[PDB]
Amino acid sequence: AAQKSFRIKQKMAKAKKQNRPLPQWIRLRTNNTIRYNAKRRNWRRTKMNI
Amino acid sequence: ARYGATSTNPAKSASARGSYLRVSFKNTRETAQAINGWELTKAQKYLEQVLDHQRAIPFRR
Amino acid sequence: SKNSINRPKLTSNLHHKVHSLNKKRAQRERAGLLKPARSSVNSKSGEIKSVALDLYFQNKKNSITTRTLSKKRAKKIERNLKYATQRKLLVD
Amino acid sequence: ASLPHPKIVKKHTKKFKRHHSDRYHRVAENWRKQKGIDSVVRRRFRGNISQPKIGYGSNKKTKFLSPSGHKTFLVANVKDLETLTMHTKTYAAEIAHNISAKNRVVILARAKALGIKVTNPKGRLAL
Amino acid sequence: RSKADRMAKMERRERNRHAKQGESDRHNAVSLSKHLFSGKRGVGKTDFR
Amino acid sequence: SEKAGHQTSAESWGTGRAVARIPRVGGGGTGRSGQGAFGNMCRGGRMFAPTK
RNA sequence: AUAUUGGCGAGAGACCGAUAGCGAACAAGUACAGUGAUGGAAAGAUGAAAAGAACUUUGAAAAGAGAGUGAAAAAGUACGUGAAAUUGUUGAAAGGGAAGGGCAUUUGAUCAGACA
RNA sequence: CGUGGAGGUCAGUGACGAAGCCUAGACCGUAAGGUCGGGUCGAACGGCCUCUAGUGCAGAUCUUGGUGGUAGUAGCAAAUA
């Protein structure tokens, strides 16, 4: 944890950047099937296994 | 929306609906049957009395 | 019974039941909920029975709403009736 | 009027329901022979349902006649109907369920013209 | 933007009625758990107190 | 496909388990785990006598 | 000349039709699980066109009732059809520690057909 | 008797409504089943002669899914409020 290595921090940064709900303008595109972020993650709710 | 059975004139009638409504179904069936066929103002008064514990909803089924 | 062997119990209940049964039946018959006689002009014996058609002609002649006519079926009956009227128009 | 026939006797007017078709929804009313070795229905005990057997076969002189006294024939068009032109006292045309209303009025016109009896003339007609 | 908010709200119905705490709850419950069907308990120790 | 219905890793749960003894998928966390696996009667299992 | 369950490009089928066909018709080897080797799903259908219900009104709001679009909301992003189990309401009926089933008939309800 | 697909045929049925589903409305068959009426539906489907088969379920502590009674019940009484 605190006193990380950089590799872990880079993967956590990617996880933070992916911690995004769906942008609304996506839903308005033609022939859109994506409705929710199916790959959404939460810290208490599913661990990322490093 | 399609209502359930209906046996009254639509010009002289009014409808209300609540769907997917998060309240216990058994208790709601008991309280709705307590005011079936009642006069509307009398039914509202009775329900306000039920909140006030002066009268109770009879639980039949 | 075993406490009142000298009163009819089953027979009294059956008399009461037949009385109440046909009082209820006569109440239904007087309100006209029963279907009319086969010879009546209001009967449909030998003719197709349709809830949709009956509601359509009841709305045209101008309530019961458990028996409901959909706007889809109402439009279909209007279209079919236009066809039938055109057929009678070519007949006459 | 129809071709003369005796009384139409049905030796078993009730339908032969399946054994426990009433007890269970999963058991349909379509008749099935009870194949159990200890089936009281198959062993034909007293007080159980009757099973189909050839003794209930209808009279040959009357086996396919409707109560009106005609054998029912399914017609889909005028061409099918005209095969009963010479058999009008022995056959009554029934209009298939999927014939549309306009084709039905054509069929009724031809049938009345030839005198062929039509079983369900009321049909899809909502004149 | 109102249409977007309406569609986003009208989508979550099935996930909410499964109490899915949002988009991040994809916990799956197995069809049967083999530890629950212990077997023939009473010989030796058993699988739970 | 001859691998149709066979690719699953599953084994029977044994006797005395108050369940039918059909092979059930191992592992966990997927809903597929614990389900009948190989038989023709089973959803996802092989067909009886795969067409050759 | 031979082999070819791989790769690349094609053409077919008396094949399967969303519990089927590859595990995967869909952001499927995904989600998820396991320290790990590995295991591994569920999930297609509004409508021709979003025209996805402006506006009024009740409600804190979800929504409701009107209105409206649409051929049809008996198509309202729970969306083609919409079975059964199971349930609500209405109408009828039965019920003195089963219910169901067989034969027959009462009663009530319902209902088809025919012209010397 | 019934079902999926194939060859032939009825110049078969079908948006004036195919299939499907619902229906104490009807008819034929000893039966498997077949036929018709009404409602619903909305785009395909039958008869006959044949061909073919992944062809018919009440069960297998069957498989997958859904749903009940239990039941508004057990219960939500550890950590002073």
Question: Resolution to 1 decimal, in Å?
Answer: 2.9
Size of chain F in residues: 52
User: CB C83 to CB D102 under 8 A?
Assistant: yes
Q: CA of D121 vs C1' of G112, distance in Å? A: 13
Closest to A23 measured CA to CA, from A34, A11, A10: A34
The 3-state DSSP composition of chain D as helix, strand, coil percent (nearest 5) reads: 20, 10, 70
User: CB C65 to CB B2 under 8 A?
Assistant: no
Contact between D90 and D67 (Cβ < 8 Å): no
Note whether C90 contacts B: Cβ–Cβ < 8 A.
no
Q: Provide the 10 A C-beta neighbour count for residue D118.
A: 19
Chain C interface residues facing chain D, Cβ-Cβ under 8 Å?
A: 46-48, 50, 53, 77, 80-81, 83-84, 87-88
Q: Which residues pair with F24 in a beta bridge?
A: F11, F36
DSSP, res C37: P
Q: Longest Cα pair distance anywhere in chain D, in angstroms?
A: 60
Contact between D116 and D84 (Cβ < 8 Å): yes
Which of E28, E37, E39 is opposite residue F30, by nearest beta carbon? E28
Closest to F32 measured CA to CA, from F18, F47, F46, F42: F42
Which chain H positions come under 7 Å from a protein C-beta? Answer: 10-19, 27-33, 35-42, 54-55, 58-65, 71-72
Q: CA of D61 vs C1' of H9, distance in Å? A: 33
Q: Provide the 10 A C-beta neighbour count for residue A15.
A: 12
User: CB E31 to CB F32 under 8 A?
Assistant: yes
- The residue with tokens 């009313």 is D29
Closest to D18 measured CA to CA, from D7, D10, D30: D30
Q: Tokens at residue B41, please?
A: 């103002």
Distance between start and end Cα atoms, chain A: 11
DSSP, res F39: S
Note whether D26 contacts C: Cβ–Cβ < 8 A.
no
User: CB A28 to CB E1 under 8 A?
Assistant: no
**How far is the C-alpha of D119 from the C-alpha of D74, rounded, in Å?**
10
CA of C65, closest CA in chain B: separation in Å? 5
Interface present between C and B (3 or more CB pairs within 8 Å): yes
